Amino acid sequence: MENFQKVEKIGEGTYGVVYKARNKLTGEVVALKKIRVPSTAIREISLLKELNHPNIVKLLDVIHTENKLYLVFEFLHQDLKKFMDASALTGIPLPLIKSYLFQLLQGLAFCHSHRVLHRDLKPQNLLINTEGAIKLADFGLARAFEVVTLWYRAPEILLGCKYYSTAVDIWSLGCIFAEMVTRRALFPGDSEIDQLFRIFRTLGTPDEVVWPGVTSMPDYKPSFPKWARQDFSKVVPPLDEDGRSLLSQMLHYDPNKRISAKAALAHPFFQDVTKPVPHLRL
Numbered sequence: 001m002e003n004f005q006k007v008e009k010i011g012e013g014t015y016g017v018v019y020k021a022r023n024k025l026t027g028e029v030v031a032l033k034k035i036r037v038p039s040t041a042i043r044e045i046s047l048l049k050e051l052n053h054p055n056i057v058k059l060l061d062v063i064h065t066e067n068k069l070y071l072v073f074e075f076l077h078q079d080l081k082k083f084m085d086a087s088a089l090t091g092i093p094l095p096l097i098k099s100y101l102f103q104l105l106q107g108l109a110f111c112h113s114h115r116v117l118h119r120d121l122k123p124q125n126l127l128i129n130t131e132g133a134i135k136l137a138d139f140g141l142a143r144a145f146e147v148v149t150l151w152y153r154a155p156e157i158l159l160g161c162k163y164y165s166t167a168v169d170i171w172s173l174g175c176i177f178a179e180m181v182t183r184r185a186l187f188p189g190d191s192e193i194d195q196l197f198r199i200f201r202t203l204g205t206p207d208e209v210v211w212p213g214v215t216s217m218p219d220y221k222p223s224f225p226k227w228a229r230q231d232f233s234k235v236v237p238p239l240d241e242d243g244r245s246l247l248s249q250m251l252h253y254d255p256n257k258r259i260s261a262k263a264a265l266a267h268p269f270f271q272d273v274t275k276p277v278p279h280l281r282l
């Protein structure tokens with residue numbers, strides 16, 4: 001660590017504080033994450049160093065010293081949460097929302113083809129730069145090992161599924177997609193049950209018809225209230241039919257019916273996708 005000069009505190013991640021730092025030797029500016037160490041984690045993280053893609057924040061180095069673990073990542077200048085807050089008055093232009101969604105699906109397609117999942121996607125770990133790129137951060141750290149938001153958590157996780165799949169990332173991204181469009185969180189729950197019931201109230205309480213096996217899930221209760229499903233035209237208004245169609249497929253209850261990243265990239269919504277440059281005030 002003596003090899004790094006902490007510049008400022010970026011934030012408090014899931015495992016440790018994240019600092020903007022400068023490599024005292026290479027003069028390189030990076031994002032340093034101190035993890036709060038099993039050999040299992042070491043190997044798992046080591047694999048992530050090889051998982052490189054344009055839409056994945058590059059894991060530059062893994063420093064394991066004094067029984068402590070530090071992860072050194074590529075540095076970007078702003079996260080999606082801050083960008084959304086800054087675009088709250090006018091909203092992010094649709095062409096830019098489409099580009100971001102398209103790029104993120106590429107990132108997921110890549111990670112998922114390598115059997116790596118994120119598990120905790122959210123505006124805070126989606127990073128953007130001046131060139132119009134957006135990247136996913138903290139990928140794979142879940143498998144390795146303030147109150148965390150439940151807003152983007154997939155229903156199978158909330159119902160107790162222990163062996164969830166890559167589909168949990170598509171769910172989260174669908175929630176983020178809707179939020180960029182409407183400028184309001186889709187499912188802002190403040191407890192697991194509130195999160196679950198907010199999902200039910202919008203998409204309808206799931207049953208054996210739309211989700212085979214759902215009633216036999218660990219945390220499923222026959223006593224769950226039964227709410228009817230709402231039209232997407234009401235859920236995400238400004239979004240065109242193609243967008244609403246894709247979103248619906250990203251939010252299917254049954255993980256096995258939920259669209260994959262690869263298939264989503266082929267959806268009609270991306271027929272006119274372009275790469276606009278955002279207006280970033282750094």
Ligand SMILES: CNS(=O)(=O)c1ccc(Nc2nccc(-c3cnc(C)n3C3CC3)n2)cc1
Nearest residue numbers: 010013031033073074075076077078079082137
């Ligand atoms: C305070 N919000 S912000 O918009 O001012 C902002 C500016 C610059 C940022 N740079 C980053 N680069 C790479 C990685 C991260 C990052 C952010 N969080 C986490 C948990 N990470 C983790 C370390 C992998 N951040 C970020 C956030």
